[PDB]
Design a protein around this ligand. Structure first.
Ligand code: FAD
Ligand code: FAD
Ligand code: FAD
Ligand code: FAD
Lengths: 393, 393, 393, 393
């Protein structure tokens, strides 16, 4: 089943501990017995029903203001929920992260009153699924070099181009898309502008879902725009100032999505330790051998260290302290440790770890993503280094 | 395409270099454009035709005596061919290794004249596919604790039980099976006996092929024996002395299968470097950035070091020097480095590395096996440590 | 100078932040300009004066009850002070840790009222220097196999034997020594008994200080007992029950001494980052190159992660939650990361890092200890593994 | 003593094996019982006598032509001798490397007939000690940015400036110095010119020897030139073409000095394994525990892999194949593995490993150099990456 989580060390209040317990129980009831089928089929059959169920719990829009139906909690609760969902299933965890943190949080931070009232209630209730589009086939890490055109004609902007790697692409009812309004600006950051593109608008179509190594079931597609007219009302923040929105979104995205590797490491431990104490070779349980004890110690220590790092940084960001380098470092460290722990878990399982009946391969394939998505490891290292360069200069 | 391989450093004679070139050309013509389809379908459609083609080249039974149609070459040529095939496709490489090294080499080393004449010609020609069975559901690394029964009645032994994880299981026409004839021997090693079980004998049936994380297409099944009568003529070596056969086979198996990680690392480099010099971000090729240059340096140095280690140890074993600890260390080091290089290659590709259109995920999933098959990493470390314990004691 | 420490992320209250600032200022004034001389001379000239100065601040016996003059604070403050002192100088940090945590804490936890009143005031004031003796030349990690004899004659126990590796050995006025009273007990743990041996008693002499690779200046010697008569009043806890005292002391020792690697990593960062932004090669500061930025990112992330882990575990232990495996894991992770960060700092400095004028070599040599002292890394891994074995069994 | 070296795997001919045996015997007789004293005193008392003894064996100038008294052997023999000397003592190994490879090889490759006849006989015989000067206080890795001035007046060049980090500085009778003749050349490489500066010339003085972390005893100083007049006859190669000489020297320097880490790893194994089979804890030798067996396996495999890499690359370079990237990679891999093995050896020794009586700390401090000297690790990674960039461009 699910190993107990020592919340005394994590320094979680009673309310947060209750939230974790409720989420764990609900996910073990509903999401957990479907993870293998989701991975195999590369499709979540009950995505909308599950989204409604999550909306009933209030985890969708957990950081959204109460007036729109949100829980109005902090980022620590958000990473708790994200960690639990990723523990239950990696792909559903990624889809939930993209829906809540990327879309709802961006709306509540950089949205007009009318836009909030129009979109947030349905997104929080779970009726609408959200997504964020900033990457392009030629501009994945160099986001400011996007090629999407957002020329302005009359009172409505006309969009042409395509965006790539959009999580929840084909299923999104509300999408936040970054486009370059001013292609002739001297700094490419100035040209960027954020728009709210909703499903059904003429010219907005999506390609077929991608076939991915891991995180299968989190529908990822390519957005296609052909003379799609976006009314001026659907503009986040202000025109030609979407770079700041993009950067703040990136910081909070890294901070929240750092919860995913925590969930994957917790799942690896949950499946490894009981097996190590059940499987026996050479006349005793394989867990009694010194090498396996060392493996368990390494996995446990890495998980605990990353968990403490993420929780403390989230607590700090709740107060108001948000620095780019810390938000990069948390996810960088968590992703690397998660990949190592997943490989170690496959090794501990051994022969049975290499077949698809056991979920260790799924854990490895899911964990490999977080070193690539939301900016690769090299990008995060450069961000931290440049943050150091800002001082002592 | 295929990057050039510096054979001047490897210290390969002209004949071996010609062998490598011929194998590379043939595999690029035939096997290479089928690797992705083999991985996706979990089945090699042209396995028997490809085996006949390999038999025409003589790579099957490359170490077998010439009188049976073999090339009569050394282990260095064997690891060369294994490396090339693994470079073309990991699963076919594993199947070839199991066919040649595990079966044909065991026959030529521990077989009677009649058994050799009966089996070797067809195995070398490619008409028959070979396999070796020593692992069981409860005895994977603790091989001496196998439960297969080999009771002797009259002049024919009767077998009951099942063996697990047999490469080339469903397709094998000749199989070498280890069974415990004397279940009451004080040392479990004494009870073990090797038998030649051929396809079609009553009571010998195979289960459905496994669904594996990687190496998909190398048909792995479970052998089922129910009152199968094996004539006494089908005994390798001598009765109750199969432990020595098993150990020598394990040593040579590790030495030859160390060529697989070399092929996988070479494939990772072949697909990574041109892409790093084609894909461009921030106004220049991504290969020009210092972090990517460091990644390339690490991958190249690890590949070269492992290649030199394997080649030198194979050359030594050709002369007659075969020590258990060296044969363990070569594959241990190669497997660990191969896994690291595969992860690094996925990272270098980035977003495109995570989709199944590009083969980086396939390389990672294939490379993870060699830390598990032919004895896990922990077993090899214990073997080396005990080899040290033998001295200074 | 000293880089700022982000206490917002660490979740430190205002009082603890003030404590850290006061300690940093005092150490930068007094201890810091003497670290190189202490390392070179292998001797702290002003040890007693510095101990009196520390006693004035109250850091000595920071966890001791107020009635004896202690501050009566928690373990978090203790690791804060230990981290600051280790940041100023590793050897003085180790000496302070041995004086406070090993001696004073053991006295306040497992001491009679009379023993407390006799010893604690002077130890806290700084007049007396404390030390703990549990390791022997043949029993370093296997502590229960100590050979020190503690035979009982009349009302006073007579001690014969020798203890090794005692920090603050030659300078200790009060020493806590573990000896085996009952050498014939079936479990060796039962024989162990703790005694309070004070300087000047006949038969108690110390050898010459050791010449160590690092931590030079923390006087380490060998205790020699020859028919030394210890009165029965000088017994910690109860006779033949010192094993529990030893184990609790080991747990708290690991928890507090985990602060040392934090100080060493902080010092490495403090000396590395400004130099990386001052030294210039190829026409720009070496800190602007991508490889150096990656090095800085790795060092910073490792430091932050270990700091969060240690602080959260100390906070938990303050409440009352103290588990052996967590207290082992904190120091294990911290020590390994500290060694890696020290090597990285030497590399970043380059040529100047290899000379003794710069402190990078001192940082490496000091950091190597924490993987050896207070139980090696292998012992901690075994402790964590056995803690897992206790459950699921 | 000295563990046997498996030369069957290394593929060494009988002559090379005899050379290794003779060098090992001689060094164990003379150099070995002095290593600790050399490290402690930071001075080799018998440097000149030992140099004469080495000249008698012919190891000095082993690659030099026979007509000057050299052995006329290849680079493989050179790395063999370097490895043996480094195994005996790291500092003497570095001094020998600087004397032979840096000076004598440079003379035999880029020297006039008169210069060869004047200098080589005495350098090979051991009467003169050689050294190479290319690094400066501000130009360590950016060698082309050296500031030494070599203005030409009449028929003799006048030198002003200073060079730093010169191995065998104070003891060198012949020195090869690189200076910038044309400070106004558009490429800084064109300005560089190589000179032969001999001891005793007016204006040429040396500073006090450096106090280093490791490699103590290899006298390293700073060269000081003040209006030193160098006759035009003392020019290596041709004027304003010393960049090619410098680069070829760097390549061969890396290739030969890669033998040093091999010697250090061999010494670590030689001191670790017997101790692991003598020291006993928990009622058995510490070498029998699984963790220690894993440590031994890792150390042995890393040593063997690096040894095979270096030997094969040296064999290739003997034939005529010398590529920059391979010569960089060999030393990069060897240095990193040597540092890891030294740390592991200190850990295996444990408490005794931390004192200066045992040589494990000396091995670590010596091994740390090769990641810094002869170009740091980052420089080598950049060299390999740029070598890849040259192709596919
Ligand atoms: C499963 C999945 C889900 C995704 N979901 C989303 C989503 O919801 N929203 C979204 O916007 N995107 C999403 N993405 C895309 C992802 O955010 C980007 O693709 C990622 O940041 C890298 O994109 P890329 O491969 O184009 O980077 P590339 O630029 O193509 O990467 C090239 C390589 O070079 C390295 N590199 C790049 N620049 C430098 C440099 N300056 N110095 C050194 N090295 C460098 C990179 O680390 C990488 O290894 C998703 C991707 C995946 C796989
Ligand atoms: C794709 C594939 C192909 C295969 N092909 C073949 C084939 O052709 N022929 C064949 O005979 N087998 C084959 N196998 C099986 C393989 O050889 C064994 O399964 C492998 O050696 C490990 O088996 P296991 O999982 O049962 O080991 P387990 O004993 O179940 O492993 C348990 C775990 O404990 C560790 N462990 C075990 N003993 C110790 C110890 N004493 N100390 C410390 N740690 C220990 C192991 O490393 C492992 O991590 C194949 C397996 C795979 C996945
Ligand atoms: C014991 C010893 C013996 C020596 N003997 C000799 C000798 O005989 N002859 C001789 O000529 N020299 C000798 N040296 C000097 C040595 O060759 C150089 O000092 C070395 O190459 C580095 O010098 P540096 O510290 O000045 O490099 P720095 O440039 O000061 O190094 C700064 C740091 O930045 C890194 N860095 C530099 N450039 C880049 C870049 N472009 N991108 C990324 N990172 C970068 C470096 O790796 C290093 O970590 C010796 C040094 C020592 C310690
Ligand atoms: C600077 C310094 C200060 C010190 N200060 C103190 C002090 O104040 N108080 C004090 O009591 N001690 C002190 N010590 C001693 C220290 O606590 C012990 O020496 C340490 O725990 C290891 O001792 P050892 O070398 O005898 O261990 P050993 O048993 O000799 O170590 C042998 C090696 O085998 C490994 N090993 C041991 N058992 C096992 C096993 N079961 N399985 C696998 N591997 C195993 C160990 O990790 C080690 O690598 C100090 C030591 C130093 C260097």
């Amino acid at each position: 089943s699910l190993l107990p989580v020592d919340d005394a060390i994590n320094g979680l209040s009673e309310e947060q501990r209750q939230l974790r317990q409720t989420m764990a129980k609900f996910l073990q009831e509903h999401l957990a017995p479907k993870a293998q089928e989701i991975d195999r089929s590369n499709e979540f059959k009950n995505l909308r029903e599950f989204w409604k169920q999550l909306g009933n719990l209030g985890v969708l829009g957990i950081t959204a203001p109460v007036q729109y139906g949100g829980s109005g909690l902090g980022y620590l609760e958000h990473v708790l929920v994200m960690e639990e969902i990723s523990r239950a299933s990696g792909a559903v965890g990624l889809s939930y992260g993209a829906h809540s943190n990327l879309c709802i949080n961006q709306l509540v931070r950089n949205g007009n009153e009318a836009q909030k009232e129009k979109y947030l209630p349905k997104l929080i209730s779970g009726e609408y699924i959200g997504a964020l589009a900033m990457s392009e086939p030629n501009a994945g890490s160099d986001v400011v070099s996007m090629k999407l055109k957002a020329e302005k004609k009359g009172n409505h902007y006309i969009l042409n181009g395509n965006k790539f790697w959009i999580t929840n692409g084909p299923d999104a009812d509300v999408l936040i898309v970054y486009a370059k309004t001013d292609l002739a600006a001297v700094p490419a950051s100035r040209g960027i502008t954020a728009f709210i593109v909703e499903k059904g608008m003429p010219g907005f179509s999506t390609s077929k879902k991608l076939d991915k190594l891991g995180m299968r079931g989190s529908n990822t597609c390519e957005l296609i725009f052909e003379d799609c007219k976006i009314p001026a009302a659907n503009i986040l923040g202000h025109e030609n100032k979407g770079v700041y929105v993009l950067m703040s979104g990136l910081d909070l995205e890294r901070l929240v999505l750092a919860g995913g590797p925590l969930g994957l490491m917790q799942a690896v431990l949950d499946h490894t330790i009981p097996y190590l104490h059940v499987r026996e070779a050479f006349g005793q349980k394989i867990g009694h051998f010194q090498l396996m004890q060392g493996k368990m110690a390494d996995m446990y220590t890495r998980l605990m260290a990353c968990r403490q790092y993420v929780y403390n940084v989230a607590k700090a960001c709740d107060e108001g302290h948000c620095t780019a380098k810390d938000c990069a470092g948390v996810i960088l460290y968590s992703a690397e440790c998660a990949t190592q722990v997943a490989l170690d878990g496959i090794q501990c399982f051994g022969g049975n770890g290499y077949i698809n009946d056991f979920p260790m391969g799924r854990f490895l394939r899911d964990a490999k993503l977080y070193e690539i998505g939301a900016g690769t490891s090299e990008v995060r290292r450069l961000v931290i280094g440049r943050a150091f360069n800002a001082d002592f200069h």
